[PDB]
């Protein structure tokens, strides 16, 4: 349904790990930036749920990645603002479940994220802390 606590959710259940599948899901979600804070919350809860698998989390990671990236592209802070905070949870918790290979894909997401500063440095650090807490190891720079 429109603007329901389910529209974006059903998208997650029909994503594909490809440029256009993510692009179509992204451009749509981008049209309803009104839902940015809500979708960020539902997105995290959907990824943190025990009823989701690594692929659905990889799909969700790619969707939000394109969304927040393209959002900064046209300065739609509502997305990157909301998604950023919940990102540290998701990316950091799925980091504890993703095999080394999907985790590598996420590692790039976390890299390009802070390299381009799609979120605030605090959010960047919170994501890094979450990944770090998964193996209890750290670095002298952020």
């Amino acid at each position: 349904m429109a603007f329901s606590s389910e529209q974006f959710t059903t998208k997650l259940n029909t994503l594909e790990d490809s440029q256009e599948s993510i692009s179509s899901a992204s451009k749509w979600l981008l049209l309803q930036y009104r839902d940015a804070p809500k979708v960020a919350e539902m997105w995290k809860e959907y990824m943190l749920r025990p009823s989701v698998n690594t692929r659905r989390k990889l799909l969700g990671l790619y969707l939000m990645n394109h969304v927040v990236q393209q959002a900064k592209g046209q300065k739609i802070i509502q997305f990157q603002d909301s998604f950023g905070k919940v990102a540290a949870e998701v990316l950091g918790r799925i980091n504890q479940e993703f095999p080394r290979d999907l985790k590598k894909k996420l590692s790039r997401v976390v890299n390009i994220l802070k390299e381009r500063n799609i979120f605030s440095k605090q959010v960047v650090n919170d994501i890094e802390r979450s990944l770090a807490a998964a193996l209890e190891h750290h670095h002298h720079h952020h």
Binding site: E16, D17, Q19, Y62, H66, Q69, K72, Q74, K105, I112
Partner: peptide, 16 residues
Amino acid sequence: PSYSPTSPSYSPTSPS
């Protein structure tokens, strides 16, 4: 699958 966790999309930072 074919998506890039990098993407060519980006824009300079600005307060507005």
